[PDB]
Design a protein around this ligand. Structure first.
Ligand SMILES: [Ca+2]
Ligand SMILES: [Ca+2]
Lengths: 281, 281
């Protein structure tokens, strides 16, 4: 039995999810080879289609860019985003998408815990009614987020709010770490930040992501995808990773990435903690 | 014949580049804007080819331009400036103008409370604080902790040793993550590896402690101009001489902070510093 090749992308979450997939297969007698954090998406995409890697975590919404359906409204539906990625990748590359994680790692807005807790903010619908009724918010975001029609203007019309120039801080780059640091330290009075759902800084900075309940943004749920050649030679991989990824909700993955990105803990040790505490190891 | 003002791609290049541009514009010297052209090797290729005329350079970087990387003279501010000034004049007829006192080098920054509480302003004070059983856990990269030129060299010069209990080792060399770890006190963090004038230091409530024995090479920013351009407008030296002498470490930190985390445009922050200091109004 050839060792299964576990890979991931270069981001912090790739290391966490890749070591989670890697540690689970090793615990059930499946021999593996380590290719974690290989590179960007195009590098991992050409590697799996060529047989150099076998299994790695991919996001459902990224299939919009692999198969030339970038702006389709179907990617805004979490369930429809999974089956279309699952069906297209099986037909085109014989890659099998396993059970996805509930975490939606897409563009969104995170607010400080005090602002969300004191005003009972859990969704972006609450966000729209809170500021439309004169609530104080200063959102730190990139000019790209504020100006591009698919981001803040799309959020504003769907949730019925408009931010005045006094309530905006536009940063030069698109790095979400800077917006998170602005709201965490309240630079220029900021209390909200442009984020990705499971960014490593959100939990250690005391921020809460507000749910895009009307689904303005495309859904990006991480899911392990495996080549069919590898999966049927040892088929237990599907069922073993099924409940593991089912308990990786937005909050759990936020804390695991934070323990790696800012806590300094190795992704392998953070992965083994999550699995033993949840009874998978 | 417009003087081409440029800079490097980071936040300080934009601030220092916009400072050079407005001081020249306010004194009747027409200029061309090439600010934030690229990284150091790209800007080194532009001025050596005559495509740009003036940009802010750091004294210690001449060690890498002239293959004298580890020479002890770069740990002396005076000898590092005069050697950088003379080598570049002999090799490319580039004239180094009056430098800034700010030392944008590798260092350790602490939270204001621990600095205030224990009267920490330099690394010699820092070393005896650890030698006396002090409370410190440092966020740094693995390279900073292990490489002989970084933490072991600080430990030898300032007489202290940090236990594994007092270290947080991060994967990358980006100082924003170490600063964010100490800013939120992740894993109890209260110190961070930094560069002297990093944009996150001031908005995160951090104080960099002085490298009083000069373990690290000194990187002082200075305007450098082609001799051909300077001889047609020779007043540029006297105009930028008192401006850069007013750019100490804390002044450059707060200007970078308002750009990188405050969202203010680099040009308006430059015009504010000059008008408040009487160089514009
Ligand atoms: Ca701006
Ligand atoms: Ca570590």
């Amino acid at each position: 039995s050839n060792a299964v090749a576990v890979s991931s992308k270069i981001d912090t979450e790739g290391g966490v999810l890749g070591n989670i997939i890697l540690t689970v297969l090793n615990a059930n007698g499946i021999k593996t080879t380590d290719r974690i954090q290989l590179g960007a998406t195009p590098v991992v995409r050409k590697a799996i289609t060529a047989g150099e890697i076998d299994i790695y975590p991919e996001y459902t919404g990224n299939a919009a860019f692999f198969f030339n359906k970038a702006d389709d409204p179907l990617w805004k539906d979490p369930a429809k985003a999974y089956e279309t990625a699952k069906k297209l990748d099986y037909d085109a590359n014989k890659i099998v998408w396993l059970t996805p994680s509930p975490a939606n790692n897409t563009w969104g807005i995170a607010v400080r815990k005090d602002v969300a807790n004191e005003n009972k903010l859990a969704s972006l619908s609450d966000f729209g009614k809170y500021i439309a009724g004169g609530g104080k918010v200063v959102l730190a975001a990139s000019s790209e987020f504020v100006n591009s029609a698919a981001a803040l203007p799309a959020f504003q019309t769907a949730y019925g709010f408009t931010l005045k120039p006094d309530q905006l801080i536009t940063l030069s780059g698109g790095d979400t770490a800077a917006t998170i640091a602005a709201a965490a330290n309240q630079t220029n009075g900021a209390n909200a930040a442009m984020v990705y759902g499971t960014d490593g800084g959100i939990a250690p900075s005391g921020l809460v992501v507000l749910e895009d309940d009307k689904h303005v943004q495309p859904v990006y749920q991480p899911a392990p995808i495996i080549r069919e050649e590898v999966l049927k030679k040892d088929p237990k991989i599907e069922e073993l990773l099924k409940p593991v990824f089912e308990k990786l909700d937005l909050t759990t993955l936020q804390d695991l990435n934070g323990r790696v990105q800012l806590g300094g803990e190795p992704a392998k040790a953070v992965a083994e903690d999550f699995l033993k505490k949840n009874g998978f190891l």
